[PDB]
Design a protein around this ligand. Structure first.
Ligand SMILES: Cc1ccnc2c1NC(=O)c1cccnc1N2C1CC1
Ligand SMILES: [Mg+2]
Lengths: 401, 525
């Protein structure tokens, strides 16, 4: 076919990323997958003259006993030229009742890849204990997980998708990387059928799970304890939480509440609130009943997501672009800690895609080595967000949930 | 013939154009005999004056031998040559090998010289043999095979050996071949006579592509000393390390001793360096002499005993389980051993990495498990089953309440003192009718008690900790402490049982003595 030329951003070179070690199970899986991709000519063995590298992994498909090859193209994506218009995010997708996510990844394999770009896709199947050199390949076709694949495949897709799009415009269709998000308001029964039809209506042309309900996603507000009696200790945690929150909502006063705190009282002394302290609390509570006014999403900025381990299988997360100016807050409840964390990451990432059409940069409360070891045991998404590792302050956890 | 690998020079770069140093009629004579032997062998070919590139050549003799050798200095060609995929930059750990009945090392001769070089790249390998008479020759040549000392040779060679060896490997699934630079370690379980015949079939196979190897009479016999190891077909160890019987120890002596001792820990269990490392404190010169402490020589003496008894590692049996076991050796020190059959160690190790200024044994034990897990995936491709001296309840209590996500794989409690426990627990809610200490270096309690103490040389943060220290000191077995120091709250709430800070170690000493302690933070002004 005719290859559309692709290039790195001006002056950049290809990626040279180290492959994190793999267990014998994942290696065999990859050797199996890659051996047949090679017979089919999708990938080819390379020589020592190609110095590039991208990490590869094997994840399990959901309720399928088969493996999916996952390629960490994050470094290459950052270095691929920006692309060149009929893809901007539909804001209608977040209000839809039902949304189905389909993996249209294999479609990409029928379109060849610019011969000159190919070398940048190099990867290696490592061997155990370095007993053998490691098999090296590069792609001959558009790989799954590269930001260029959907762009280069844009035209061939709009075409196979214009019929359904006008023969059923009650449906919204969005594509992000390897997925197709199909949205509708229909009954969850009407929906699954219309979804199956699109399946064959893509099979017609050669193309081959996840079900969301965005209409039911809501913000997790900052809350205040409501209680029968208030001890000195309660009031203290109250003033501390309120003070933090006042930086987001300046209408929060603590003057009367602080006033009940004067004196060096026993921590357990019950303190009947005055009339002023009571009204003050009331207003504060009123103020926090909704998201601070003003915050808006700036498409030119990064989406940042932070997670906190609360306890008993619960986590809290906020998504912002600027500190204190949260776009969304939420909660996630249940296994082991790592598994929970990966599922919360995937969930928060899907949400961002569905609402803003972008993936967030995560700040994860876990040590790198632990994370790097286990995330693939539980990962199921076909994309990989960027992430960094942090040390959660004990005060912030408190201020959430 | 072996297929050619395409090579290029770094972008926007030309070949090297460097002057051949003035030789000596004598050295010119030699280079001319060498280059002549070589052009008849096809290794090199005279070129035209069409080619403008030049690389310096010279001649040396064999170390402790009377014979001429040709050296070519490729620093410039190399600076300009493209990067290649790393040569084998990670090597096998003995513990991950499987035992063999027989292992043979085949030394490859003229390895590089048997491999062709990219036709369009040959031009950059030009060099010049100078003439003896003024307006006479000045012989020019370029390489046709891979040159010694050139950037891409190890990589291109490894890559090619891998393609040549592939067919043999398919027909001979019985044989295991490891390629390490110039050597080929070949192991099998064939009856010894069958083995010898296969080795000969390998030699034949390699000769078809011009690769020469040593005959049975001249092959090295195990044990093989490789990368600091001593390998047998059936067992492995570090090559014997011997401890000096000096009476005078230099700072430098000790660092060498510690290094060696460290290497030994991978199979010798029980090695200790804590006291020998303490000798290094405040040292002013690599040549300063430090006298040994009663403690440093007990340790040295103990190590010297452990090392007398040679202990070997056993090789991996893939049909069996890996078990990893861990023990607390001392404050902040853990030792582990990984085996398949009891006391038949595949490998041992120590862990002392302190990740942060304050920790507890639970945290540290957990980081020990992580390290071993990563090491295991690398050497054997799977995680072992751990046996730990901690009960699930202690583990769960800490994990469940720590702010970081954590995980420990499949584990069985093993009752091997010392067992890890949490030394104290902070109350989750305030204690009723327990005195309330308000700190800010001094305190004031609800009972009218107080002390504004004096500290000199104290840092901002360290003044905060001190105050808490005071409250803990002058209070009873049940206390409520209110502080505005988010820093203190952070340290203490992590519940450390060991610290770099002496003050922290004191606070810890107090927390262990108390019955119930409750810490609360309140904003500043
Ligand atoms: C250094 C080295 C590296 C990798 N493998 C091996 C060796 N050398 C051996 O001597 C060795 C020892 C025991 C079993 N296999 C061994 N071999 C295997 C190849 C037969
Ligand atoms: Mg105070």
């Amino acid at each position: 076919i005719e290859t559309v030329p692709v290039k790195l951003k001006p002056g950049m070179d290809g990626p040279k990323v180290k492959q994190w070690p793999l267990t014998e199970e994942k290696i065999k899986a990859l050797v199996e997958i890659c051996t047949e991709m090679e017979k089919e000519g999708k990938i080819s063995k390379i020589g020592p003259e190609n110095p590039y590298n991208t990490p590869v992994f094997a994840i399990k498909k959901k309720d399928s006993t088969k493996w999916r090859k996952l390629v960490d193209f994050r470094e290459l994506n950052k270095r691929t030229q920006d692309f060149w218009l009929g893809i901007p995010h539909p804001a209608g997708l977040k209000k839809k009742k039902s949304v189905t996510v389909l993996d249209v990844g294999d479609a990409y394999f029928s379109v060849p890849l610019d011969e000159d770009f190919r070398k940048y896709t190099a990867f290696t199947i490592p061997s155990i204990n370095n007993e053998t050199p490691g098999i090296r390949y590069q792609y001959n076709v558009l790989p799954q997980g590269w930001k260029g694949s959907p762009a280069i495949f844009q035209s061939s897709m709009t075409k196979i998708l214009e019929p359904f799009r006008k023969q059923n415009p009650d449906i919204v269709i969005y594509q992000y990387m390897d997925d197709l998000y199909v949205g509708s308001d229909l009954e969850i029964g009407q929906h699954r059928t219309k979804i199956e039809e699109l399946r064959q209506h893509l099979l017609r042309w050669g193309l081959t799970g996840y079900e969301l309900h965005p209409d039911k996603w809501t913000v997790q507000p900052i809350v205040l304890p409501e209680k029968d009696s208030w001890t000195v200790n309660d009031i203290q945690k109250l003033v501390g939480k309120l003070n933090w929150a006042s930086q987001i909502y300046p209408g929060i006063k603590v003057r009367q509440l602080c006033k009940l705190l004067r004196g060096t009282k026993a921590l357990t002394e019950v303190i009947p609130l005055t009339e002023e302290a009571e009204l003050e609390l009331a207003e504060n509570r009123e103020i926090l009943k909704e998201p601070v006014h003003g915050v808006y999403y700036d498409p030119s900025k990064d989406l940042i997501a932070e997670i906190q381990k609360q306890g008993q299988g619960q986590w809290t997360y906020q998504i912002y672009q600027e500190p204190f100016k949260n776009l969304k807050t939420g909660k996630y409840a249940r296994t082991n800690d790592v598994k929970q964390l990966t599922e919360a990451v995937q969930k928060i990432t899907t949400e961002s895609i569905v609402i803003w059409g972008k993936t967030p940069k995560f700040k994860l409360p876990i040590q790198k080595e632990t994370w790097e070891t286990w995330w693939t045991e539980y990962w199921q998404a076909t994309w990989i967000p960027e992430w960094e590792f942090v040390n959660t302050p004990p005060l912030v956890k408190l201020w959430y949930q | 013939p072996i297929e050619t690998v395409p090579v290029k020079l770094k972008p926007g770069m030309d070949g090297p154009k460097v002057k051949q140093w003035p030789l000596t009629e004598e050295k010119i004579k030699a280079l001319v005999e060498i280059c002549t032997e070589m052009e008849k062998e096809g290794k090199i070919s005279k070129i035209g004056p069409e080619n403008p590139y030049n690389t310096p050549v010279f001649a040396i003799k064999k170390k402790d031998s009377t014979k001429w050798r040709k050296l070519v200095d490729f620093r410039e060609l190399n600076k300009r040559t493209q990067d290649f995929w790393e040569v084998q930059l990670g090597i096998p750990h003995p513990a991950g090998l499987k035992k063999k009945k027989s292992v043979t090392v085949l030394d490859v001769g003229d390895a590089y010289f048997s491999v062709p070089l990219d036709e369009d790249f040959r031009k950059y390998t030009a060099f010049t043999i100078p003439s003896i008479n003024n307006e006479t020759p000045g012989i020019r040549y370029q390489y046709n095979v891979l040159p010694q000392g050139w950037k891409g040779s190890p990589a291109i060679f490894q890559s090619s050996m891998t393609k040549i060896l592939e067919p043999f490997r398919k027909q001979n699934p019985d044989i295991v071949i490891y390629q390490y630079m110039d050597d080929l370690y070949v192991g099998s379980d064939l009856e010894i006579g069958q083995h010898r015949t296969k080795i000969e079939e390998l030699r034949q196979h390699l000769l078809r592509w011009g690769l020469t190897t040593p005959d049975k009479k001249h092959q090295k016999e195990p044990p093989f000393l490789w990368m600091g190891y001593e390998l047998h077909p059936d067992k492995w160890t570090v090559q014997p390390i011997v401890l000096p019987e000096k009476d005078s120890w230099t700072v430098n002596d000790i660092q060498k001793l510690v290094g060696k001792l460290n290497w030994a820990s991978q199979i010798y269990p029980g090695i200790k360096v804590r006291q020998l490392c303490k000798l290094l404190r405040g040292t002013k010169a690599l040549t300063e002499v430090i006298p040994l402490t009663e403690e440093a020589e007990l340790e040295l003496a103990e190590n010297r005993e452990i090392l007398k008894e040679p202990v070997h590692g056993v090789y991996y049996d893939p049909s069996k389980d890996l078990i990893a076991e861990i023990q607390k050796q001392g404050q902040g020190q853990w030792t582990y051993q990984i085996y398949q059959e009891p006391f038949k160690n595949l490998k041992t190790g120590k862990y002392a990495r302190m990740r942060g200024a304050h920790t507890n044994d639970v945290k540290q034990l957990t980081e020990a498990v992580q390290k071993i897990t990563t090491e295991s995936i690398v050497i054997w491709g799977k995680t072992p089953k751990f046996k730990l001296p901690i009960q699930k309840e202690t583990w769960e209590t800490w994990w469940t309440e720590y702010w970081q996500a954590t995980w420990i794989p499949e584990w069985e409690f093993v009752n091997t003192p010392p067992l890890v426990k949490l030394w104290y627990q902070l109350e989750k809610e305030p204690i009723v009718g327990a005195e309330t200490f308000y700190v800010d270096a001094g305190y004031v309690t609800n009972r009218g008690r107080q002390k504004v103490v004096t500290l000199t040389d104290t840092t901002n943060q360290k003044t905060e900790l001190q105050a808490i220290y005071l409250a803990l000191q002058d209070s009873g077995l049940e206390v409520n402490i209110v502080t505005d120091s988010q820093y203190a709250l952070g340290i203490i709430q992590a519940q450390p049982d060991q610290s770099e800070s002496e003050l922290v170690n004191q606070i810890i000493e107090q927390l262990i003595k108390k019955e119930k302690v409750y810490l609360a933070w309140v904003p500043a002004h």
